[PDB]
Symmetry: D3
Subunit: 298 residues, 6 copies
Amino acid sequence: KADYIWFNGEMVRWEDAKVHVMSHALHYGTSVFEGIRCYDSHKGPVVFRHREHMQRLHDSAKIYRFPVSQSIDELMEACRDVIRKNNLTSAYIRPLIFVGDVGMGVNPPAGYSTDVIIAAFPWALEQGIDAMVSSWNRAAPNTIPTAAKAGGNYLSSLLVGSEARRHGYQEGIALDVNGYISEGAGENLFEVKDGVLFTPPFTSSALPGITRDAIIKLAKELGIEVREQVLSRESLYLADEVFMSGTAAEITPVRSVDGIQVGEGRCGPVTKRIQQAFFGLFTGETEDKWGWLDQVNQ
Amino acid sequence: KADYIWFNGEMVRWEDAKVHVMSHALHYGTSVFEGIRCYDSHKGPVVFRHREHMQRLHDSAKIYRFPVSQSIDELMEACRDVIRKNNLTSAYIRPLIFVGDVGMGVNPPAGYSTDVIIAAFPWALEQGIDAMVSSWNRAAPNTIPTAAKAGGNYLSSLLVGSEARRHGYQEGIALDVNGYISEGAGENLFEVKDGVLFTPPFTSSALPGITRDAIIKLAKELGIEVREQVLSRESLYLADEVFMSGTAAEITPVRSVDGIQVGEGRCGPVTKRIQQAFFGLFTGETEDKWGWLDQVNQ
Amino acid sequence: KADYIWFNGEMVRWEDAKVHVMSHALHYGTSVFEGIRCYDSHKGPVVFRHREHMQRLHDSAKIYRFPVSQSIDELMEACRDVIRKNNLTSAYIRPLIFVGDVGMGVNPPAGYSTDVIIAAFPWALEQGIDAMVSSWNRAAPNTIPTAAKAGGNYLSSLLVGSEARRHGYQEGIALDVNGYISEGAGENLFEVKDGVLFTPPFTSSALPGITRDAIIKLAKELGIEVREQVLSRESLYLADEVFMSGTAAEITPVRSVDGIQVGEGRCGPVTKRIQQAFFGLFTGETEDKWGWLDQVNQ
Amino acid sequence: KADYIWFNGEMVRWEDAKVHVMSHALHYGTSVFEGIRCYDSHKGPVVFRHREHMQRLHDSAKIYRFPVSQSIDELMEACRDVIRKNNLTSAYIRPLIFVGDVGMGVNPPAGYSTDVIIAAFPWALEQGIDAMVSSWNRAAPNTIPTAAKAGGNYLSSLLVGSEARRHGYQEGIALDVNGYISEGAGENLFEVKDGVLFTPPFTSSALPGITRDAIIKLAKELGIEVREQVLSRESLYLADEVFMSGTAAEITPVRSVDGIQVGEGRCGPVTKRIQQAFFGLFTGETEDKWGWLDQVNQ
Amino acid sequence: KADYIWFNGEMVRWEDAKVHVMSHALHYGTSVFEGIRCYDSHKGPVVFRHREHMQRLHDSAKIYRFPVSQSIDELMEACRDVIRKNNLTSAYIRPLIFVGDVGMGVNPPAGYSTDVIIAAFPWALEQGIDAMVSSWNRAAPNTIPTAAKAGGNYLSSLLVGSEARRHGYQEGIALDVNGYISEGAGENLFEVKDGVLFTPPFTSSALPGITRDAIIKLAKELGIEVREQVLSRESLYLADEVFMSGTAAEITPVRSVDGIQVGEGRCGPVTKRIQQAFFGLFTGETEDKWGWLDQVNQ
Amino acid sequence: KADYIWFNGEMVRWEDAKVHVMSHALHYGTSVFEGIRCYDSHKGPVVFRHREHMQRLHDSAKIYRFPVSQSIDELMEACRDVIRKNNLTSAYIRPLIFVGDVGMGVNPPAGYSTDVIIAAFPWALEQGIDAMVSSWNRAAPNTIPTAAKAGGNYLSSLLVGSEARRHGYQEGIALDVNGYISEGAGENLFEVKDGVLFTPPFTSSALPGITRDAIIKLAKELGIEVREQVLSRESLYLADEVFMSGTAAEITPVRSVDGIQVGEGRCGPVTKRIQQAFFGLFTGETEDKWGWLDQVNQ
Ligand SMILES: *Cc1c(COP(=O)(O)O)cnc(C)c1O
Ligand SMILES: *Cc1c(COP(=O)(O)O)cnc(C)c1O
Ligand SMILES: *Cc1c(COP(=O)(O)O)cnc(C)c1O
Ligand SMILES: *Cc1c(COP(=O)(O)O)cnc(C)c1O
Ligand SMILES: *Cc1c(COP(=O)(O)O)cnc(C)c1O
Ligand SMILES: *Cc1c(COP(=O)(O)O)cnc(C)c1O
């Protein structure tokens, strides 16, 4: 929780940010959102890969044809505004584009506009978590677009994630409809074999993670070979290391899958190198060669 | 629109029925709903298959493990209350169970409770509509449960339905991932061949429609043979008649699929017999042998 | 061979029935055809299920949207004429609708007409044949419609059939993409287990055979239970009897599959009963309750 | 049209190149063909990748086991002869190997020979075309070989292409049975993301295009990264550029898919570079390092 | 254990029934087996559906082409002899046909014979068991025959069953590759909806259980409707009753699946009726109309 | 055959190496094994990639959770001992971990130990073999792990291999459930097209061959490009060269597939180069850069 939420261009008090119960998105999952992080760095509060996230927000809406009146730049300025207005230095930002109070028909009436909200609030990675392969599979290829970060998609992440927690594990790993590894409930999956980094392609129903992309680029900078390919379920038991990636989860090591220990049962050497290079970005140790750090105070 | 909405046991003015913008269901499609109709009949306002719908509401929540504090009977009484309080005789009822303002984590915290809302509002079938087979497929079997009427499911119905309308058709027909007929965007599909009634099973990713079930039971009463089996796409072009079924759509004839006329291009004889038997229920002509008509004033 | 071939409304001498090498159908498989049989009966030359075949010819053309100028009755009279003009009593008729000398573009230009020809010519059942399961699968559900009897479809029947011949068998049995039994290279497949008759549904990529349909109706008249269901490959080795059906093949018993003998290795009792009832139609022993025999001489 | 057509070793007048209506290929799609282009260049009339096309003609026939008595060299000489004898400088060549007047059985009798024809005739720019994703899928992997350019295969291209034109688009894009991008109705598909060229592998039911291969080699010469990988449907909406390739279509840019604009809605930068390099081959600007230009005069 | 084991026609002491460590079946899973039960009845020791099991033993060997020198009758006599010679009245019989000490090549040398063993030894109620849906799927249709009860098949049952026990459940339920219900780890699955009995067909990778078959026949005698059809995963949560069937497991009620209670959490009404009818066979209460009881003393 | 077999830590005479007929592995395929080769080299008897094979033995057991008391080094010393004790210089070693005389329940009781045996015995490459594509497919992805070399897996290799033999071929090539090339009955498959080496990934249900891995590393040393990708069935007819790899089979060229000759019908140039480099390891010509040769005499 925090004071003020950016709502359709206005800074509204947190308490007053309410929508009608007949809002389309509440009944039909017709919303698109993002997960962004603001880090306190050597150069002050900085939004990690800000433009990339807002670009994906637009891409997700594009796929479902949701009309978005704000440009990427407008959304970016609004985001910084909400962090400053709330006096935050370290936070989690949540942009949300949703179909509001329009008719009750599935197809919104022509000429409608979407409601936009940007809320920000203040904001394990060493011992490694225990994961299990879920009995639920992720969405098939040409059904509900897995490349779009839409609300309705999360019924799948709820099923996969809750099942793992009900059986005593920290996270669940979902396979696609073909029986290949897709990703965790809400984070991308990586494997390290003989010093090589492996990760499933988007065609394995894995969402194009921005943390995932950052890791791939950092790994190449470190001289580590990266192979984007379909992975079998057994590979999880044969891998030297395995870790998850996501904005909220950052880089989370996995020490065991289905009760089977992953090489030594602790954060591996390659996972360690990547973690250091990742966190080094906010200390100045890792040079920001790509322009991933967006200053809140511009 | 109407006055008053039943909200967690209280009759709230329509205008005051608001939820916070950080409600779980707005971001993750974590809601379950129903579509029910109240008809003005020979015995006054009557809710069609009231118990069946509330039972499915509970079943849908059960699958996702959403805690529901109200019993089927409590929900049924609440529903009648909202129709009476709003002085409605002919209406569309919308029960909605959703995860409200809890954390922002996908998995709701243990001990949480769901918010429940029941809104009601006042409420083609002769010439037949033109349909097209969509380029989007419905959810694969063990991914997102198609038997549950959940909010997140509707991203699929939006894609299928919007595509049909963008190309000039009234409704889209989706095939499953195997290439077999599933159903329309938001309604079940029926075919009539040589005086025989055909409809895809639930395993073709078709939601167990209550209108669908009613038609099957009425057809048997009329002495019409019903075959629940997987159907090929071509069968749509070879069928003598084809129609859709749903609470909102009732019994909608389809006169053409993909520009190909369906036997004579008008409402067929078998579709007609079923329509008459269906609407006869609210005139007294068709005996309510199953107890499908629930009086609002009990 | 024979004299005269009906070509676009005219009886042309067999040798003069030629078309240009640039005919669309020669390059793109854009043709639809039928297989019909004329039997010498107790009532003289009689075309078996004449109307049904011409109706399917029209249905196959309808699916591909090939314009057909002739009505079902016109085609039926032309067929009888070809049999009479050729002084045939027992023959195989081959109606063929094809896209002729139009452009070289895959999509024929608007306003084009198809060419139609009807050729007829004079026309292993006691012991049974040896069949093998092919390594090639039949067309997937929403690719090339298997319900339509089109020319291009036969590339598949060629692959399945030639492979069986090459290995010393009389016919090959194709499985669909799922690994279930579809049918023989160019004939439907039946199995008899505990006095029960089994056959794959059309959704197993099996063409809606007219001989297949006749067998199902005759079986029911004989009091034999018929189950139209998906069949596993192993079922071929467990079946008491197995036989193929088609216009050209009629009812052909299968005494072995993949070198494995089918219960006693001879024509089974149920296959025999069905054969007798089938051939009894042309002797008068079996009453033609359906009006399947169309007299040539009218 | 034009005068003369090479028919089984003889130059026959166009009007006289006729084949019997009972030719196998007319009824069973049993033919194999090629599409070749002759361009007027800085070195005169030149056949683009002549040997490559004739080699594929042989490969297609080999898969179906069609007997071809002519060698690659004989066919190449015949092709040049057709262009010279018809006084063509710029034209489209169509070699066709087909099963002619043999029996009516699906399996041609042992010892048969195929008929061979080679016809030639005189022969979506900077704005691009509008495409839509078809509701029809391309052939599954082990059904009808997608690597062979056979006549029967085109029933698929007809379904995909006609649907697109019926809805107002210029071309349709088909997905395979898995829901992944395969290719256009009769041309390969390319995508450009962040300066990288993407194209589906043959295993996505995409025919091994010779234009496709040329583009891949030219791209590498230009220093452009090429990734041959499975592509999701959503990628079409996220791509910076998208274009089709084929002998007839050459390099055709796609400005929109399903009504969604492809980055700026005009021919993209990378597409432009590749087009220039491609057409530069006929002006001498692009050095023919591989020997793709075969002079007619030799 | 017990004394004596029938080994290739000879009653050998239990301790002496040994085979070489280089026996084919130990390395390649090349064995076929059965599970039979001998019950103490009102007519003394009786082998339940004796001939049916021996017939399936032969059918399993036939599919893999394992040479069996003993006839069904010889095996049946041997079985009775094992029970008598070991003075057993209530026991579990295990016939095993396996490829013994032949070469080490996968394909046994022509002319080989299999070794046959028949061992017998002395032999989830009213509360039911807790089951979970496994993360492992059962064998795909045309891979390893699911209709054959072979040794190698059990690696699957081991994976499915062990996972369930590792998580605290009594049995695991496997889905096929399509995401539909197949069966339990080593027993068939039944569901009861509105007084109707449902069970997956063999094509859902479910082995043709002999107990399964018995239940279907008994159900029909009791006037209960039986529907053999593909079942979705969700159906387990919507069913009124669910139970497993197998020779060892007999009729075991399932009170919950994945932590979700199955209607009241106790043995259901229909399950009870079927259990009573089943066990009534051994008390004389249920007339043995089919001849399922084979007396040991004969 | 040979004298002595290492059995649970003791050198037992070959003839006395027996296990009870009730051993778990004989009934349920619950065993894991390896195939290792001892070559007579320029350095004397040498076990090829000894450590790698024992590591895979452990990995296969780990996937099934079979307890293994011996470490990799213990197993390696035992292996050398068996070769020495048997006075072998060139031989085939067969390590086998299996579940022995434990209960009859599929799930072995807690605290059980596995039995381990290591047997060794003394131990078409120039012309090439004739292969055919089998009608049986290899195990689907998430059914029975294809990465594990377990006994039960071989029911599949038996079906694929025996079918090829029965039709006069030397080996059968299996396709996966998708219709893509997987591998031979018990050996990995390679293809050579334009000087490029191709092989299916593990996700095509291909076991991670150790000979396969060696070939890939040798190819890279020779400067040959290696592409690990999914391959279509047709690619076998279009390839310039095709060969199989395995411990027993080493590098076996394939001169024809399905009666279709593979480029010239003899051992190809690239296959030759790889063979020479492979066998050169035991002559000293090829430097053992990886430490693949483990000396017996240490
Ligand atoms: C958001 C999300 C991710 C993580 O993406 P990041 O851009 O790295 O935050 C991974 N998987 C799913 C299903 C997601 O929704
Ligand atoms: C609600 C719904 C239907 C119609 O069900 P009825 O119970 O008949 O109203 C059909 N299909 C889908 C996808 C639905 O959500
Ligand atoms: C024509 C055909 C059949 C047989 O159908 P009939 O109408 O009974 O002749 C079976 N399979 C295929 C693929 C066919 O084309
Ligand atoms: C011929 C063809 C192409 C084009 O390949 P080019 O050799 O480049 O002309 C593409 N797709 C299909 C289906 C084709 O038949
Ligand atoms: C043996 C077996 C069954 C049980 O069948 P019954 O003949 O009734 O004992 C069920 N499933 C599997 C996988 C089996 O092996
Ligand atoms: C053992 C095996 C191979 C060959 O692997 P190598 O380690 O090289 O001997 C190939 N396929 C299968 C199915 C195998 O079991």
